Each structure stands twice: as C-alpha cells, then as structure tokens.
Amino acid sequence: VYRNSHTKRFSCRNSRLKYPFEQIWPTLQLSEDDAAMFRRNSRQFVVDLSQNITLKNKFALNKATKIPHQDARALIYESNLHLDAVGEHPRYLKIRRVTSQYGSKLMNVRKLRLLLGFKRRNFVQKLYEHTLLQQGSNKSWKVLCALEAKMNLAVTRMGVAEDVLEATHDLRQNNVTLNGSPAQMKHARYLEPADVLAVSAVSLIKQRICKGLFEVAPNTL
C-alpha cells in the first residue's frame, strides 16, 4: 500500500467539506497552492452581509464556547438561514438525509486509526471491546481514556516527538523506558496512573528539540 492516502498530505478525507480533504498534522509544511485549497473550508461569503466570515466567527454568532461534545457536529457541517445563510432563499438550503450516516461513521473510525499512528482496524475494534468491560458509566469517556493510556500517544504528549508516527519509531528503537527498563508489549499495553517514562537516548532527543526551536530562539542571551 504505497498509496497517497498513506501520506500526511492526503491522509484524511471528509466528503462533507467544500474541499474534501482535511489537515490534521500540526508540523506539515504546505505550499501556497495547497494552503489555498485548504483555506476554502475556513472562509465563506454571506450575500446579505456582503462579507467573508470564518469558522471561529460562526461559533461566536451562535454563542458557542463550551457545548456538549455531540452538538459540535451540527455547527461544523450545517448552516442556518438566520445567522450564516441570511438572504438565501429556502429553496436552495442544503438539508441532509438519513442515508449519509455510513460515510460519517466510517470517516470517524478512520480518524481514530490516524491518531493512533496508522493502526489497523482490528486494532481499534479490540480497543473498543476492552473498554466495554472496564468500569465506568459514560462509554464516550472510556474510549477517550483508552486512547490516552496508549504508550506512543503519551510519549507524544511529553513533547519529545513531532507527531505520533515519530513517537512509534522511537519505541521500536527503545529510546524511551518504562519503570527503568524497556517496556514489554509496548504496542499493546495500557499505561497506569503511576507509571514513569524516561528518555534513554538523551543526546538524540536533546538534539531533536534544539534543532526544532533554533530559529525561534532569541539572538540575545
């Protein structure tokens, strides 16, 4: 599978956006043309107001700062005739059908695979089955906890890797230890609230961070 969909540029696809793709890698450098393509999902033109508005402005118009996590879907992908689509005749407003769920559900499962570092689907399925047996009342939060308990994602949170993909390579090279020794079942285990992570390749990681921030370091000491 030497496909373009396995590269960062085209990793994520969303059919409900004006530009079908979506950018999720915070360290990817885009060209001028690529940035223009992605920018079409951020700016929209309003007829009556005769202005361009952004996605952030749309949230402010709806008075949305902290909302139930299931309600953000209706804001990102839908439009309203009284706030953001004023002046458009109702005949030309887009309303979804019950037949679009499958595309959305498949897309979200693809996102979980991408965040974990291009994992296989069976990997995600077993992760979901694991949470079904653990104690807890809210199913949604149990899934979130499982993602955080993964070792490679935790290494990314520490701030020593550019992204999850780089963190995974570090584990294969044993650049990070668990409780003083290299981890066992590092790709399959979950971290516990008392685990300790340390860097064993100190020289390598220090060079990585210094080079990354060399240009943003001040010239006066």
């Binding site: 950018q23 999720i24 890698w25 915070p26 990817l28 450098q29 885009l30 940035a35 992605f38 920018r39 999902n41 951020s42 996605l55 952030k56 949230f59 700062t65 902290k66 909302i67 139930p68 996590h69 953000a72 809210n138 949604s140 939060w141 979130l144 609230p193």
Partner: protein, 159 residues
Amino acid sequence: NNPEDNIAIRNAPQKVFQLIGDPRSGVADDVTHNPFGEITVEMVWHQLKNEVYWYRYEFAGQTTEQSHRDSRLSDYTKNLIYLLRAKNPRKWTIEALAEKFHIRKQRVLAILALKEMEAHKIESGKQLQGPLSPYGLKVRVEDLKLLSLDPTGCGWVEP
C-alpha cells in the same frame, strides 16, 4: 476566602435542593433538567499557516473554570513545596501541602519525586556546571523562615 480572588471557592461543590408543588399540600423533586453538567468540547486554537484546528474536551467543563492553572505552577512554587516537606515532615503532610497550594495529593507527591531526582543530579555534578554553577543552592533546613503577607498591601513580615 472571597470568590473574587479565590478560584477554588468558585469551583466548589453545589448543594442542590429543588422542588415543584405546594409545601403545604404536596411537593416533588424537580427532575426536569440536569444541573450536574456533562462532557463539553471547545475550539482553542486555529493555525492560519497550516489550517489546523485544535479542540479540547473536558469532563466537567460546565462546573469548573481555569483548570489549566493546576499543571502550570511556577518553579518557585515547586521549590517551596520541596523545602517545606524537608523542613518539617510532621506538620507538612501530603494532605496539608495539597490544601495549601490548591492542588491534588497525587500532584504533590509527583512534584517531590521529580525535585528529589534533580537534586541528586546537582549534587553528583551533572547539572549546573561551568558558568551556571552559582545557581545551585545548598540549603540547611534549620535556616529557613517563611514570611506571610499579613499587612494589607505590599510587604512581607516574618511571622
């Protein structure tokens, strides 16, 4: 202990007692809404050069405020916790330190472990070498006094 300058007092458990009906003839608990909160999401950042959006999920977003302060305590505060524990372990228990600095007990113990490891490196001679040597300080527990902001305004007094 005023809500204006005490975020902790603002983020305090609420005692809920709501009723519908007539207290003289018949009443029932009001169960028409959920006043205990739910999981929330919020957009935090937008990078205009790469078109990247950041979303933050909070378990108790509707009943808390400024939760980002707990994990971003200054280095001065952490050193103060380390010195207080060493000075008098009998009075400065994990419970007392957690209450003093408005953090959890797990965070208090974790901070102590990391500071202890750093101290060993400094004593062994692995950190603060060369031009930065003067910044490694050895402190005797007896020669330590904690000042208080008793007088209103600027000024710290010994007692």
